[PDB]
From a paper:
In mammals, fatty acid synthase (FASN) contains multiple enzymatic domains to catalyse all chemical reactions needed for de novo fatty acid synthesis. An ACP carries substrates from one enzyme to another, sequentially following the chemical reactions. In metazoans, all essential enzymes are included in a single polypeptide chain and are arranged into two main functional domains, each carrying out a key chemical process and named correspondingly the condensing and modifying domains. The entire cycle of fatty acid synthesis requires that ACP carries the substrate from one enzyme to another repeatedly. Here, using a strategy of tagging and purifying endogenous FASN in HEK293T cells for single-particle cryo-electron microscopy studies, we characterized the structural dynamics of endogenous human FASN.
From these two separate reconstructions, we generated a composite map of human FASN incubated with 1,3-DBP, in which an ACP is seen bound to the KS domain. This composite map is of sufficient quality for accurate modelling of most of the modifying and condensing wings. Comparison between the two reveals motions of the Ψ-domains against the rest of the modifying domain, which remains stable. Indeed, we observed that the β-sheet of KR serves as a hinge allowing progressively increased motion from Ψ−KR towards Ψ−methyltransferase (Ψ−ME). ACP is linked to KR in the modifying wing with a short linker.
Author numbering:
A (entry chain B): 1729 to 1815
B (entry chain A): 857 to 976, 981 to 1144, 1211 to 1295, 1313 to 1316, 1379 to 2067, 2079 to 2112
C (entry chain B): 857 to 944
Write the structure that this text describes.
Amino acid sequence: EQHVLWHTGGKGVDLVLNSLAEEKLQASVRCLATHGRFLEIGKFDLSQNHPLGMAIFLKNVTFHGVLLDAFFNESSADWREVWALVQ
Amino acid sequence: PSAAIYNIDTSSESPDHYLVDHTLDGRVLFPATGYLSIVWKTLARALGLGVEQLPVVFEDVVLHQATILPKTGTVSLEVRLLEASRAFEVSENGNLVVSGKVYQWDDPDPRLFDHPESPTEPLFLAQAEVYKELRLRGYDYGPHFQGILEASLEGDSGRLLWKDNWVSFMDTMLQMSILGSAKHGLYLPTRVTAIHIDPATHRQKLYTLQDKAQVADVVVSRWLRVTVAGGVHISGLHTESAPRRQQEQQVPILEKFCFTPHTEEGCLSERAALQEELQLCKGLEDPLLSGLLDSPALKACLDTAVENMPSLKMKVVEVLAGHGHLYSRIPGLLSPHPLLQLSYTATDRHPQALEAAQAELQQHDVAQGLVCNSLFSRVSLRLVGLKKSFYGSTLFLCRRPTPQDSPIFLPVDDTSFRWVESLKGILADEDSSRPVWLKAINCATSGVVGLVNCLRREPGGNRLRCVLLSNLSSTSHVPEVDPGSAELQKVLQGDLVMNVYRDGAWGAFRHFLLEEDKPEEPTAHAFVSTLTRGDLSSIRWVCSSLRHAQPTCPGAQLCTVYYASLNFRDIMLATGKLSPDAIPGKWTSQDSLLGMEFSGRDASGKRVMGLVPAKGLATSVLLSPDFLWDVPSNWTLEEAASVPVVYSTAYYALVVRGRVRPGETLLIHSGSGGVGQAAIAIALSLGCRVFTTVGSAEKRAYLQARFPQLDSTSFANSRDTSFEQHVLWHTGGKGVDLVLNSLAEEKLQASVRCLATHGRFLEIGKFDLSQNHPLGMAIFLKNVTFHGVLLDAFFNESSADWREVWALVQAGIRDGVVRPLKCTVFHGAQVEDAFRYMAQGKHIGKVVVQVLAEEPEAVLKGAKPKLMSAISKTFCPAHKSYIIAGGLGGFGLELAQWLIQRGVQKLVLTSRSGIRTGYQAKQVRRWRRQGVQVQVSTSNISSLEGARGLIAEAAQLGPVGGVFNLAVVLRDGLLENQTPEFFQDVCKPKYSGTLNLDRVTREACPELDYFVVFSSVSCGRGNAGQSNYGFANSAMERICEKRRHEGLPGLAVQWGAIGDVGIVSGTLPQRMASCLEVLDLFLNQPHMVLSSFVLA
Amino acid sequence: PSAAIYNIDTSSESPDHYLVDHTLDGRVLFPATGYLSIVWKTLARALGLGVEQLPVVFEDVVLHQATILPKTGTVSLEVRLLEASRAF
């Protein structure tokens, strides 16, 4: 957190691809810049229903819960897009 | 036993007596770190360890309420902590005030307290000016909390005192954190992320100075959002501004200083009631009976009598006080004069009168037994003044005869002040008992008025200096008069302290006349603002800064406004719940911030509508052409005023951010609101299934009439959480795809429980986000996206997305998707009514203000706004230059800041030395970073060549607009018995300097419009020690009078005691904010010399 | 005094003998609603009212651990509640 906040001039980053556990997810969300996007691909912190402070959304921030497992049941329209991108 | 209770006593003997030094704003508040101290003590007691042996860690500290400490009383705080849950709470009357987490560190790492390296100077900021700045900002800290020993200019490094007190130490760390940040108003901490304390490292990080004091180093890092000092480490401090108490403990006594002739003939004219009443009585207590009684003519006579009173003591006797009622006005008129002991007695020949005993109880006395409403010579009295009007009534006044002889005449009219020794010799012997008559003849530019005022109260020879002879013929040698033995006889017959001949008439200068209410001028550019914060009855039209400066840069354009729309932010700002600093933008100048959209005509007369970040409610708006749309021919401007912000927010939320696809389910909260209606229209145009929560049945009926594609299954109730069950049952337990939420707590959770898989939550509310309420992150297992949507971010940067939003809005306007809402029209003279109407949520659609009626034409070029009367205000063009003489210290810096906030881009400051103190350097650096070019010059003002060079240097930057004289040299404490010629000579840098300024401005300053000099009360009321000071100030007023008579601008202000920059003559210090406010009021007045002071 | 302590005994004479019928999997576990019962009783005692006279509301109940009831022994549960914070 201190490293990125010092090497970006106190602005932060635009995208965070987070796969770390508690007391590090909060650090990661504290590294977000304005109009930042948080991409959560972890499971433990989500499965335990840990709290999240909603004051971070005053920075015009988007929070994403990303799970690839949902494509094996329905919604093949997005899977075609992903397949085309991979190809 | 689990609840530890702490009693807080602020008595002189209590161990917690130091808390009396925490007076953030007229109120003693418990320090935010006192809660941490007591929680730490409670945890240490629970663990059975001492505080100094327990390294502790705080997390997610939240403050919910402010604790006020009464002077006579005691408050109790109960703290309970859950060791298993690792939490704590603080409550007073069972009401939560602090919550968070606390636990033992049990593994202290000293590397956490290493000072981070700064991203980036002999000058530094010392304690006195640091706390002067804090006092100016609002913080009235006391000696116990004044722990900042030294601070850097930018406020990122310094030194902190250690007094074996953690509360004061942490309060000083917070003070250092808030010092550097530049915000207007007081900011109190509300949320802190983490605090670490390691007392062993704290003791290891302390060093001693030569003064045998213990200090620690503090650094503040804004990039890392961390404040570390000694063994304390605060991270993620959050502060929010609090409203001003508005104590208004500085009531300004305001007057004007005028020359009053002794014999006023035909006064009380140009009236209204008296003129008609004269013929009404001719055809056929009372205004006609008392016309001159309430006029300021009586006040001048009363002031003259007071000045004639030998000592401050005065005895007044009322005769026949059974019919007349002048006893109810004389005591009131003497209140403004400070240090006056008045004994008033009412005597009536008939004791049966005087039934108003309660009126006499207002500091008056009763009794039973010269002013009255060829017999004068029979009593052998001397007539001083006569007041005759169109009432035939006459007001007389006779002096008290006091025989005297040996009239000493001393010619004061002379340079080099060699007469001072002669005056000392005349006033040397105490056993003189002979009047002294000062004479000024060959120079109307004499300040002997102030000298006689100050010398008259001198200890020893007080009554010796009796009167002056000043010939102030303020004309181009038009009149002519010369003194002499015959001329002296008329003056010497009446022993009057003041004897002034002004262009034909003999009289005296009066400092008793009061002032009037606000001035108004007819202008074409104005806006609306709340004169007093939080009051909706103080909303009026105020002249704007767009008239003086209209640069109209390529990325700007000036448009005339016909209709303006009101929003919720406007209500919050007007009623005071919202702070002006929450508005995003460079709004460091206190001004109106009301309005976000408008409709009218541009420079070419094209009918245009647009969106602005602020200052929407105005007669004209300057904005970039990017934030503009063309009104279609089928629309009128009235309904066009309601489109921009609503549809912009709706499109940005739905299309740009939500990326809604046709054939989806949406939940739109508060469907009757503007944003709700726009979202409904967009979703229906895209062909989507829509659920809307509605407040009442009438709103449901209106929505059904407006959108015929909605059925009875699409409506829910917005006043509770039943909409969750409704949507979950009508969607078969699946939920909706998009939620446009604008509802508060216990309804946001219900809304998020209505989300389906791959759902998108669009949050456009603020309260629940501002309070940092928790959100369960188990909802993200449903592959859900959470959106925080704020349109305000587009007014600063990232125009790429704004172009997309603009294109979407334009495309919607091209087809029939975008429809104007219904509007309620309020005229421009009823803005208060509009605010009151919208304050209650009984309206449907939009509330708009008709600034100007729409013309029937289509392209009306040259649409000059109609003239409108508004409150006058002072603004300056950006192409001019202004000079402040001696403005590099005290009042000068504050005046320069005030002028800069009013639109000044070129400043020249003169001082004997350079920038010496760190405060001046900090102010100059901050002003230079703002884009204002400021020059400090060492050119003298008393020399002709120095004044010419200074004026040339100022003109090099640009045309000179105004000159402000603030230079002062104080040879004070100089009684007349020890006053030499040299000291009174050196006490005149604002005499030769002012004369040179006058001459040079008259020579080569044809665009000048401001000419301001700063006087003092001692020039009109007198002070013992400042004789030469008053002498300078009086003639500095005289020159202003002459230059005003000549037609050029001229103003002199008599200031009382001024605080925030350090009682004189019984006058309390005046706060800087009130000083600037009264200065702004004075600058628009038509009088030449004005006074301002606070009575003791 | 703020911490109410409850002793759970599964003996044949104890009033809480019926808890022996909770054997989810070869193990006697404290019922998830026994916690609600004891918290309700503690709140009623704190308010000075009977359980049958106190309508109560629970919110955001989270279970962190499973309590095993030994056949020969006794476990003690301490319940503490913060009236101002409205938690337990």
